[PDB]
Structure formats: structure tokens, C-alpha cells
Design an enzyme around this catalytic site. Structure first.
Site, PDB file in Angstrom:
ATOM      1  N   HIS A  68      -4.696  -3.862  26.071  1.00  0.00           N
ATOM      2  CA  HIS A  68      -5.681  -3.352  26.731  1.00  0.00           C
ATOM      3  C   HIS A  68      -6.561  -4.350  27.264  1.00  0.00           C
ATOM      4  O   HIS A  68      -6.888  -4.490  28.532  1.00  0.00           O
ATOM      5  CB  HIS A  68      -6.329  -2.378  25.828  1.00  0.00           C
ATOM      6  CG  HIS A  68      -5.575  -1.148  25.467  1.00  0.00           C
ATOM      7  ND1 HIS A  68      -4.462  -0.455  26.222  1.00  0.00           N
ATOM      8  CD2 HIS A  68      -5.411  -0.506  24.278  1.00  0.00           C
ATOM      9  CE1 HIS A  68      -4.050   0.421  25.407  1.00  0.00           C
ATOM     10  NE2 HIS A  68      -4.479   0.248  24.338  1.00  0.00           N
ATOM     11  N   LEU A  89      -5.760   1.344  32.296  1.00  0.00           N
ATOM     12  CA  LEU A  89      -5.763   1.105  33.631  1.00  0.00           C
ATOM     13  C   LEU A  89      -6.023   2.219  34.301  1.00  0.00           C
ATOM     14  O   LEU A  89      -6.344   2.420  35.577  1.00  0.00           O
ATOM     15  CB  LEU A  89      -4.448   0.537  34.326  1.00  0.00           C
ATOM     16  CG  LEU A  89      -3.980  -0.779  33.900  1.00  0.00           C
ATOM     17  CD1 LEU A  89      -2.544  -0.943  34.196  1.00  0.00           C
ATOM     18  CD2 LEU A  89      -5.013  -1.883  34.252  1.00  0.00           C
TER      19      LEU A  89
END
Ligand SMILES: NC(=O)c1ccc[n+]([C@@H]2O[C@H](COP(=O)([O-])OP(=O)(O)OC[C@H]3O[C@@H](n4cnc5c(N)ncnc54)[C@H](OP(=O)(O)O)[C@@H]3O)[C@@H](O)[C@H]2O)c1
Ligand SMILES: NC(=O)c1ccc[n+]([C@@H]2O[C@H](COP(=O)([O-])OP(=O)(O)OC[C@H]3O[C@@H](n4cnc5c(N)ncnc54)[C@H](OP(=O)(O)O)[C@@H]3O)[C@@H](O)[C@H]2O)c1
Lengths: 481, 482
Positions: free
Chosen positions: A252, A192
């Protein structure tokens, strides 16, 4: 050299600021955390008189031999090292004892008292560069003996992994709940913090071109892919208990998916964005064993990369996957019927992180003379965004059906961005508690079936693409090669 | 140098082929037509035994003199194939409107057909009328009466702009030609339909779901089609004075671009289905009223480099002829209701430029003022290009509202392409009769108002952008300046 230009808001220059990095002797703190704080200082994003306190079980020598060893941009930013280190202190103590944090509270209050300004009730940010088993102990000690003075806030950064399935992850979340609430907890999934991941929202929701296209009326298939040429590299014993799905896919790639598929938030408020990520993940059924292909890499045929089972740290008979392709179903009105493929593999043909959106054929009037448009967003090795479209063949043609495929091509560490965001109170790029549990529930039944041996990985030579079964799985899912 | 590789089909090597260029002494024939035939020869797109017959009133005793001083002057990429090509070229002297001069041509061409290497001597014949407009009807009548092919061979007639100066005059020219040839045999040239980027509009729009899903009023706010030139009339303003910028470039070229940009998807990629859809679009456009235009006329460039338009002695005094025009069109159908279409064309302005700009609607939330309207730009001149303007997050350490504008960038003469198509019988890129009349009806009411003086052009300095009124006209139409 260059001059430091403060980009910090005046609202953040009101109080002292202390950043306590627990585990300051550990690898992460000195290889990632402190180097990021240094880049933030050079970027003018730290308030002028911030206090940074290293905290470890194990001083001016230490600051110059171990910390700066892992700094970067030194050929251009070496003029700012000493001014930065002027902000750094060292505090020795344990991570799980209340009285060691009462001493820190006095030590930090000593630094807070030295701020130039009337307000001494400083803000305090704790970065737990600690193994996950220490998170609960540290959070309990911080709450009991190191809270800020009245007026200043407190924030705690913790990084993945929080567990290895729904149960283990939920227990850690429950252990921290008594000490801090969500507005105070900042869970890091470091993808992120990447530029291309953060640009997903702006790409999707600031542009009518992409807004009008981003649904099942026009999209045939979405693929999110992680590839690496390296293997486990001796440390297969640590990877054997993780597996490719937990290492990269459950965390992820699923964050990339949430941003790629979520609904538009009415505003850019942090919690409105995280609300939409959670709402999307709740539309996703658990992944069954018929929606995955697993692989485990063998010797590279050239001898360069040895087999995964050839590491003595790896138990023999291991069913641990080094390769996985997963198909997810998003049951909502934007995405009903659209296959989402998550792919991740170690020891494959190239190093590559990208998103591929395949659009539906324009069937008439070109038929076979056209091909599915695609949008590709690539993060590694080189950042890129491009659209694949069909155009007429340049030059003198005999008919309009002579065409070719062409492209419209688009012309800072992750911890820097996330640490900066935490300092400003922006939790957009941090994993909320409910978000963590929904994501675990998508993958955990498959992960339990894999651990029990119900899914045997397919051997593939290191350096190839992976199991051939995976490419056929992707085609049968609705992707066209 | 390079070797000539024949790209011609066996179907075209079966019979003789003759291409008769009427008006071979005129500017177009020697600057455009013959140079194109040469490139087609070098490109291997003319059949091996083609015969090219130049045809003009001017006598040239030494044909080899004509072929090497006036014809080759305008050839390009020169040079190993020039002489072999000229060996394919003949000269015929005669009038354009006398039957017996074409009976002589028929005997001359038949001798070339009889010399063909092959059993079939019934050759195909293509006539290119590089003539002033008043000769089009006369030549077609003479061709029909004394120069038709033999049984096996076809005949095709290429006609050059202009086809009329309004609806009435244009209809008469078509009516005068109807007795001599039908539509399958007529090839009307708008040379913009020979440009690469104009031909790629159809493919861009209809081979790609990305553009197909976006190409309507739910997503498009404004469409602009623009022609710009830095040069003026260049002394020869007297011929431009009776034409005007609208007839010169807008009624024909830009309206062809408009039709391809706005039409519905054709049922197939057949020539007539494409032309059908262009016609059906043009029928959705109401005539442009004088409240939907801004006119300009360029004056001295202020630097002295470029003289004023009225300073040409060829230009009548008191001329109301426009050298600049912005027009607003309304397309009344479901795809485009409410979407303004702007046609802009101007001589002696700030740059040389032909492009299409499609402005999309704002994505209002969640970025608001931190975003801007996307755009699709398709540029033909000076350099070909296609790109999308989009909003992306500002690179580096930022809030999410720090954005910047960025771009996704796309990664042969026109007469050459059109002549090749004519030789193959592909009329997709040629103006059909009904297409011509619908286009004239859009512009003729305004053109009559201009000729009667009801719309006075606004002076603007050569080299500037044009009248300020035109730029405000565009903003009030719904365009947002980037
Ligand atoms: O230019 P570009 O790099 O965008 O175009 P490209 O190289 O054609 O992109 C390859 C794309 O097709 C897939 N692919 C590659 N080889 C394949 C094979 N042999 N069988 C099936 N799928 C295959 C890749 O999947 P991965 O990206 O998952 O390899 C990726 O999605
Ligand atoms: O690169 P890009 O070409 O995408 O970006 P750009 O050159 O910034 O955009 C040019 C566009 O803005 C218009 N424009 C230029 N100057 C203007 C002015 N002073 N007032 C109003 N409109 C103006 C042009 O209209 P025209 O091209 O019709 O002049 C064109 O549509």
C-alpha cells in the site's frame, strides 16, 4: 428515494455485459464485491442490462439473506435493491475444472442471448474473489472453456497478495502468463482506489504551485505513514507470517510513494502513468537493515490491549514486527539526497493515514523565527490537505521577527472505483506485472533478513507511539520535529 | 471591563514622554490620532506617565469641554479607562508657523517633563503633524527653532499624506524640511503600511520556502493589486477634484503594496534594508505611458441611490478628474521581466474590496484544458483572507480529466500600529525620502498628461464594475478570467 441516472457512455451500451464473481459465497464477494456492484448500479455506472453471475462451490432466498445483509446506504437507496437483484444469477461449480466453465459459457451465453440488441458477442469480466492459490487454476479454466464470443473482450480482476517475496510473487505471475496478457489482467492494490491516493496525480501535475516545488531543490524529507490503534486482535497467527511490512508497507504505502515521486507522464494514458511508476521504483535501492527500525507491541499498561506475544496463536520467540519505520533512497535527479520514510504501526497512539512533505528552511532573513513549511495529505480518519506556513503574529508587534505557524486548509468504496475502471478498460489504478516485481525486490532482502532473525523488533507498549529508537531514526534522517 | 497591563519596556519608562498633536481640531486628529492613542493606552503600550498635548489655533476656554464632546466622540470599544486617559491630555492654543508660539509650548512641555516621577527630566518628544500640507514646512521650522528636547531626549516628527502632487512639488517639500530634521527623525505616513495584511507580505514571501520558490516570472503569469469602494466622493468632490484616484490611492497605497510584493529579499530585517529593497525595486519600473492606462469617472447610479460625480456643486464643470483607473506597470528586472502588474482603483463601484491576486502559469501537460491557472489571493478588505486556488480531482466516481477548482484557505487600527512604531523608533513602515521620489517618477508623466487633458476619463455608472474598456485592458494584459 432517488432516480437512477445513467452515467454510462453509449459505447458501453453496445453489447451484453456479464460480470462473473468467483467465490460468491466467500466473505470478500459478499462483504466487498457485491456491495460495490450495488453502489455502482445506484450510481448509474452499470450498463442497463448487465448480467451479474455469482459462482461458488456451495437461490432467490440467498440473494436476499446473505447478499443484502452487507449492503449500505439502505436508509436512502433501499428502493433499488430488487431492480438490481434482477441482474444477479447463481452458478454452482468448481473453480478449477474446464467443463464447469463450459457450462458457465452456455449459461452466460443464455444470458447474453437475452440482451435487447442485435450484438450478442458480449464482454465478460471475471472477478476472482478467491484465495491466491486458486488464481492460476481459475485463469486456466477460464481460458480453456469460458472465453467470450468474437468481438467481446475478457478481463480478470485479482487482488493482493501475489506472494510474500520476489520468488513466490514471480512464480504466481509466471503461472498466469500463459492464460492472459497484461492488457487483460487487472491486479488490485485497494489503496489505488482511495480518493486521496487518486488525487495525488492531479494535485501534482495540474497545478504550477505544486509542480514548481516537487523536487530536491525545495523538499527536505517525505514521510508516508499508516497508524492504527488496534492490535492483531486474537488473529495473531495469521499476522505472524505476514508482518507489518508485507501487510501495508511493501504494497500500500509503496504505491502511494510511486505516485508521490514519479515523473510527470506526457499524457494521462493508462500505460504512460504505469510506465512512470515503474521507472521510479527502479531508481530505489534495496532496503538494508541499517535503514529500518522494527517494533513489537506489548500490553497497553491500561490492560485494554494485551501483548502481541500473549496471543496463543502467535509462536513464542516470534520476531514478527507490528511496527516498522523504513528509509528509502531514490537515486534520480528529482530525488537524489531526499529521505523517504515509510512508517506503519499497529497498536499505536492514533488511527491515521497520511503523507507529510517537509520543505527546506528559508534560512534568511528569519532564521530561527521561521520553521519548515509542510504539505500534509491525510486520508484517515478524516480527509484533509493543508500547507503549514509561517506568518506574522496578529496584533501589535515590536518587530517583524514575531511570527507563528498557521495553515492553508483545503475546504464511495475503493472497489466501486476500481471495478468501474476495469469495466471501462482503464488500468491506471492497477498493478502491472513489472511493477509488482520491482516493488518486491526493494523489500525482499530485508524481509529475508527479518525471517532469519537478523533484525530483532524493539518492544513498545500498546497505545504509545512506538519504539523511541524510531523517532530518533526519523530525526537523524533529516526530519525536524 | 479589563485591567491595563503595561507592555512598555523599561527603556521607555526612564524619561518623560510627550506627544504633541498639531492640528488637534482637524478631522484626522479626532477621528484617527487621538482614538489611536486611547487604544494604545488601553493596550498598555503608552508609558505610564505620558503627556499628550493637543495643539490647535482654535481656543477652547473649557479644555474639559473639548476633551469630552469632540475628542471622546470617536473613541471605540467603549470605557472604564476614558477618564484616566484624558487626565494625560492637555490643550495648547497657538499658530503653526510662529516661533514664539512654540517657545511657549517648550515651557508648557518642560513643566510636564519636570513633573515626571523619576530623576531624569530630559524627556523625549514626538510631534504628529495632523495638518494640511502647506503647514508641514512651517511647523517643522518652528519646532526646530523653539521646541527641541533637552540633551538626553530624542525628537521625532510624524508627517501625514500628501507629500507633494508630483515629482517637482514633492522634492521641494523634502528640500524645505531638510534644514530642520534628518531622515532618522522624520516619519512619513502611508497608513496602508500599518495594515496587518500589508505587513504580513514580507513574512509570507520570505519566511516560507513554498512562496519563496514560486515568486518569480518562471511561475507567475500576472499580478493584480486592487482597491474598490462602493462610496463616492460623498458631496466633498471639490477636494477630490485636484487629487484624482491615482494620487489618492495608487501612487501611495497600492505602490507600497507593489514594492513589498515585488522586492528582492532584504539582507536583514532591519528597517533600512527593507526600505532599501523597496527603493531598488521601484527604480526598475519605467514611467507609465498613457497607452498603459484606462480612466473612468462615475455618473448617477441608474437606481438614483448614489448621485453622479459631476452632479456635486463643489465639482468644477468640465472636470477631467478620474475616479477610476487601471494601470499597467512593467518591472524590468530578472525576477519580473515580462510579468504584467495591474494596479486598479475605483470609487463608486460594485463592492468594497482591497486585495492582491497573483495568477500563476498554466501547467500545460498532462491535463491541458482540464486544468486552470492557480492563484494566490491576499485580501485586506472587507475581510482579511489568504487562499490558493488549485485544481483537484472531482470528488466521487469519475476519467482523470474530471476536475474542479478548490481552495486552500488561511486559518488594531493602522495608525495605532504606526504610532506605536514611531514611539519605539522603528521606521520600517514609514516612507523614506528616496522611496517617495522614485514612486512619484513612475506616475508623474501620466499625471501631467491627465491634467493637460490628453487622457479623457470614460463615464461609468455608479455601482457597476467600471468602464468596459478597463476589463478588456486587463484581458489583453495577460489575465485570464476565472
Ligand atoms: O497539526 P499536525 O497534527 O500536523 O502536527 P503534529 O501533531 O506536530 O504532527 C506530528 C508529526 O511529527 C511527528 N511527531 C509527533 N510526536 C513526535 C515526537 N515526540 N518525536 C518525534 N516526532 C514526533 C509525527 O510523526 P508520525 O506521524 O509518524 O507520528 C508527525 O510526522
Ligand atoms: O473567489 P475569487 O475572488 O477567487 O473568484 P472570482 O470572484 O470569480 O474572481 C474575480 C476576479 O475576476 C475579475 N472579474 C470579475 N468579473 C469580471 C468580468 N466581468 N470581466 C473580467 N474580469 C472579471 C476580478 O477583477 P477585479 O477584482 O479587478 O474586478 C478578479 O480579478
Amino acid at each position: 428515494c432517488e432516480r437512477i441516472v445513467s452515467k454510462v457512455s453509449e459505447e458501453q451500451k453496445r453489447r451484453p455485459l456479464t460480470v462473473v464473481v468467483l467465490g460468491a459465497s466467500g466473505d470478500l464477494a459478499k462483504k466487498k464485491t457485491f456491495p460495490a456492484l450495488f453502489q455502482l448500479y445506484c450510481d448509474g455506472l452499470l450498463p442497463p442490462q448487465i448480467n451479474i453471475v455469482g459462482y461458488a462451490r456451495t437461490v432467490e432466498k440467498w440473494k436476499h439473506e446473505t447478499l443484502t445483509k452487507y449492503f449500505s446506504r439502505l436508509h436512502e437507496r433501499s428502493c433499488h435493491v430488487e431492480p438490481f437483484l434482477k441482474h444477479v444469477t447463481y452458478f454452482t461449480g468448481s473453480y478449477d475444472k474446464k467443463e464447469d466453465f463450459q457450462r458457465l459459457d452456455e449459461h452466460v451465453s443464455k444470458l447474453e442471448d437475452a440482451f435487447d440488441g442485435e450484438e450478442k458477442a458480449g464482454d465478460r469480466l471475471f472477478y476472482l474473489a478467491l484465495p491466491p492459490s486458486a488464481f492460476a487454476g481459475a485463469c486456466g479454466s477460464i481460458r480453456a472453456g469460458a472465453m467470450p464470443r468474437e468481438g467481446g473482450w475478457i478481463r480478470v480482476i485479482i487482488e493482493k497478495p501475489f506472494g510474500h517475496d520476489t520468488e513466490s510473487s514471480a512464480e504466481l505471475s509466471k503461472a498466469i502468463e500463459p492464460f492472459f496478457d497484461e492488457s487483460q489482467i487487472y491486479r488490485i492494490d485497494h489503496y489505488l482506489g482511495k480518493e486521496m491516493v487518486q488525487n495525488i496525480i492531479t494535485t501534482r501535475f495540474a497545478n504550477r504551485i505544486f509542480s514548481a516545488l516537487w523536487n530536491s531543490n525545495n523538499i527536505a524529507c517525505v514521510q508516508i505513514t499508516f497508524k492504527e490503534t488496534i492490535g492483531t486482535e486474537g488473529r495473531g497467527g495469521y499476522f505472524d507470517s505476514i508482518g507489518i511490512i508485507r501487510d501495508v508497507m511493501q504494497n500500500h504505502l509503496t504505491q502511494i510513494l510511486a505516485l508521490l515521486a514519479m515523473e510527470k507522464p506526457n499524457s494521462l494514458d493508462a500505460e504512460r502513468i504505469r510506465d512512470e511508476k515503474v521507472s521510479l521504483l527502479k531508481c530505489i535501492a534495496p532496503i538494508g537493515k541499517d535503514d529500518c527500525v522494527l517494533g513489537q507491541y506489548t500490553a497497553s499498561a491500561d490492560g485494554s490491549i494485551p501483548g502481541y506475544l500473549e496471543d496463543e496463536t502467535v509462536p513464542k520467540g516470534s520476531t514478527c514486527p507490528t511496527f516498522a519505520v523504513l528509509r528509502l533512497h531514490i537515486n534520480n535527479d528529482r530525488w537524489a539526497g531526499v529521505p523517504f520514510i515509510l512508517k506503519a504501526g499497529k497498536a499505536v497512539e492514533q488511527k491515521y493515514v497520511a503523507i507529510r512533505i517537509q520543505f527546506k528552511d528559508e534560512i534568511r532573513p528569519y532564521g530561527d523565527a521561521a520553521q519548515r513549511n509542510e504539505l500534509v495529505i491525510r486520508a484517515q480518519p478524516s480527509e484533509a490537505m493543508y500547507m503549514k506556513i509561517t506568518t506574522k503574529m496578529p496584533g501589535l508587534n515590536e518587530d517583524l521577527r514575531e511570527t507563528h505557524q498557521t495553515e492553508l486548509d483545503l475546504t464511495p468504496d475503493a472497489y466501486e472505483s476500481l471495478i468501474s475502471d476495469a469495466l471501462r478498460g482503464n488500468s491506471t489504478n492497477f498493478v502491472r506485472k513489472d511493477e509488482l516485481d520491482v516493488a518486491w525486490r526493494i523489500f525482499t532482502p530485508l524481509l529475508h533478513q527479518i525471517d532469519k532473525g537478523e533484525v530483532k523488533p524493539i518492544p513498545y507498549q500498546a497505545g504509545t507511539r512506538g519504539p523511541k529508537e524510531a523517532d530518533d531514526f526519523i530525526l537523524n534522517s533529516g526530519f525536524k520535529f
